[PDB]
Amino acid sequence: CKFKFQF
Amino acid sequence: CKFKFQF
Amino acid sequence: CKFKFQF
Amino acid sequence: CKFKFQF
Amino acid sequence: CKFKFQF
Amino acid sequence: CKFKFQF
Amino acid sequence: CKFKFQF
Amino acid sequence: CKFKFQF
Amino acid sequence: CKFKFQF
Amino acid sequence: CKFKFQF
Amino acid sequence: CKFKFQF
Amino acid sequence: CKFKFQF
Amino acid sequence: CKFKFQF
Amino acid sequence: CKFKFQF
Amino acid sequence: CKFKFQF
Amino acid sequence: CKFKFQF
Amino acid sequence: CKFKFQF
Amino acid sequence: CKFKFQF
Amino acid sequence: CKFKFQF
Amino acid sequence: CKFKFQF
Amino acid sequence: CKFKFQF
Amino acid sequence: CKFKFQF
Amino acid sequence: CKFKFQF
Amino acid sequence: CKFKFQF
């Protein structure tokens, strides 16, 4: 919801 | 919802 | 929910 | 929920 | 540097 | 450096 | 360095 | 270095 | 905090 | 905190 | 903390 | 803590 | 020099 | 030098 | 030098 | 040198 | 602090 | 601190 | 601390 | 500490 | 001539 | 001539 | 001539 | 000439 960081 | 950062 | 970091 | 780091 | 985000 | 996030 | 996250 | 996370 | 410097 | 420096 | 330096 | 240095 | 900070 | 910090 | 910190 | 820290 | 001289 | 001289 | 001289 | 000289 | 500091 | 510091 | 520090 | 420190 707040922060979604995908690599 | 707030921040979505995708790499 | 807060932070999701996937490598 | 908070931090999910997968390698 | 490329991205500099300060919250 | 490429990404610099400061919370 | 590539990612620098400071919480 | 590649990832530097400081909590 | 008192100081947040993103160089 | 008192100081947060992201160099 | 008093100091958080991410070099 | 008093010092957290991530070099 | 590049930076002179007298705190 | 690059940095001179007198705390 | 690169860094001179007088704490 | 690269670092001179006088604590 | 009492005296702060920056040259 | 009492005297802080930065040259 | 009493005297802090940085040259 | 009483005197801190950094050259 | 330039600076005279006496304690 | 330049700086005279006496304690 | 330059710096004279006497204790 | 440069620095004279006497204790």
Residue numbers in the entry:
A (entry chain L), B (entry chain F), C (entry chain R), D (entry chain X), E (entry chain E), F (entry chain K), ...: 1 to 7
What do the authors of the reporting publication say about this deposited model?
To address this issue, we have used cryo-electron microscopy (cryo-EM) to determine the molecular structure of an amyloid fibril that is formed from peptide PNF-18. This 7-mer peptide (sequence CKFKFQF) was artificially designed as retroviral transduction enhancer and increases HIV-1 infection rates of TZM-bl cells by a factor of more than a hundred-fold. Each protofilament (PF) is built by two paired cross-β sheets that interact by the hydrophobic side of the amphipathic peptide, while the polar residues are pointing outwards, creating a positive surface. These structural features provide insights into the molecular basis of amyloid polymorphism and virus binding, and improves our understanding of the molecular basis of peptide nanofibrils as retroviral transduction enhancers.
We achieved a spatial resolution of 2.86 Å, based on the 0.143 Fourier shell correlation (FSC) criterion. There were, depending on the position of the peptide stack in the fibril structure, three topological types of peptide stacks (α, β and γ) that were arranged into pairs, which we refer to hereafter as PFs. Morphology II consists of three PFs, two peripheral ones and a central one, and six peptides in each molecular layer. The peptide conformation is kinked and shows two chemically different sides: a hydrophobic side that is formed by residues Phe3, Phe5, and Phe7 and a polar one that is formed by the side chains of Cys1, Lys2, Lys4, Gln6 as well as the N- and C-terminal groups of the polypeptide backbone. The peptide’s amphipathic properties lead to two modes by which two peptides (or cross-β sheets) may interact within the plane of the fibril cross-section: a hydrophobic and a polar contact mode. The hydrophobic contact mode occurs between the two type α peptide stacks and between a type β and a type γ stack. The polar contact mode, which occurs between type α and β peptide stacks, involves an interdigitation of the side chains of residues Lys4 and Gln6, similar to a steric zipper. The zipper-like region is flanked on both sides by an intermolecular charge pair that is formed by the ε-amino group of Lys4 and α-carboxy group of the peptide C-terminus. Only the peptides in stack γ, which are bound through the hydrophobic contact mode to stack β, adopt an angle of almost 45° relative to the fibril z-axis. Morphology II shows a strongly cationic Coulomb surface potential, which originates mainly from the side chains of Lys2 and Lys4, and the α-amino group of Cys1.
